[PDB]
Symmetry: C3
Subunit: 89 residues, 3 copies
């Protein structure tokens, strides 16, 4: 009955994103070399995985948030957190 985390990172500084599902909410903590700051991501889910890739200098994050049998993909591409095409059927 502990919280459940997921992490990703990029570059050599580095930048780190740590997502934490606690009591059906997933929050984000962010490192870009100067301290941890609470991030923009806030979405429901008891379980969370993450991946990320660079395109040049631009990070792209995909956060998979599952409640029950329902996994929701949240997409960061530098313009906010939008919902992805991800489904499972």
């Amino acid at each position: 009955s502990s919280v459940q985390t997921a992490a990703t990172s990029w570059g050599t500084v580095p930048s780190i994103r740590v997502y934490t599902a606690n009591n059906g909410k997933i929050t984000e903590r962010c490192w870009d070399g100067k301290g941890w700051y609470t991030g923009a991501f806030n979405e429901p889910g008891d379980n969370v995985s993450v991946t990320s890739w660079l395109v040049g200098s631009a990070i792209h994050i995909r956060v998979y948030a599952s409640t029950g049998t329902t996994t929701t993909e949240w997409c960061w591409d530098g313009n906010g957190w939008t919902k992805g095409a991800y489904t499972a059927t």
Copy 2:
């Protein structure tokens, strides 16, 4: 309760593999730029983790399926999924 996912990406397109443990079984959803489709991965498990890595253009995936204390490793290196040499002791 909730399903438990694990993701990895690679490239800049990118390619994304999203593994989902649901009711004791792990399956795989795949993105390579033109839509999600169900992958060939299909092995038992109540927990999943994943890592990948490129040797040039070739992708290499490692899936750590766990059921109780037993964590099996599944290897994709181009010609299908093979059980890997991982153990815990």
Copy 3:
């Protein structure tokens, strides 16, 4: 229930670190091309995440060990496992 794992890789060889939470304790199993051994990492946690990044040849690993609402970051920077600056939202 079932044990829970996290994994990261680096290089072309590659090197793999598979972390495993089992009744409170998180242990590590390491691959560097010549088989699986047991790594130095040993910290308490009911759930673990991990990420890693290269800086030239030097690997850097962050392991997020959670127990209850409390998540602890462990840092590999080629000189051991030190406690990280991460705190929660």
